């Protein structure tokens, strides 16, 4: 169950437009894309901790 939960945590948007980094970089300019990606980075770091 622990591994299942860790894997499923990757679908969380974390208050962003998408949970896919490639989609964000393909849909937004880099200045906005970085701000969108930062929230996902923080959420995934919290999940790993």
Partner 1 sequence: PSFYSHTSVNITIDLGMKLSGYGQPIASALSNITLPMQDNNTDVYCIRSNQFSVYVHSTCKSSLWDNVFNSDCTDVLHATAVIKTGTCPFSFDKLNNY
Under the rule (CB under 8 A), what is the footprint of partner 1? 17, 26-29, 32
Distance CA 46, CA 24 (A): 21
Measured from the CB atom, is 36 or 43 closer to partner 1?
36
Measured from the CB atom, is 32 or 42 closer to partner 1?
32
What is the nearest approach in angstroms of partner 1 to the Cβ of residue 18?
A: 9
Measured from the CB atom, is 19 or 47 closer to partner 1?
19
Token pair recorded at residue 46: 């919290």
Token pair recorded at residue 19: 């949970």
**Are 41 and 31 a contacting pair, CB within 8 Å?**
no
């Amino acid at each position: 169950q622990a591994l299942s939960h860790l894997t499923v945590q990757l679908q969380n948007n974390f208050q962003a437009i998408s949970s896919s980094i490639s989609d964000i970089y393909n849909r937004l300019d880099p200045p906005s894309a970085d701000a969108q990606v930062d929230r996902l980075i923080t959420g995934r770091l919290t999940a790993l901790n």
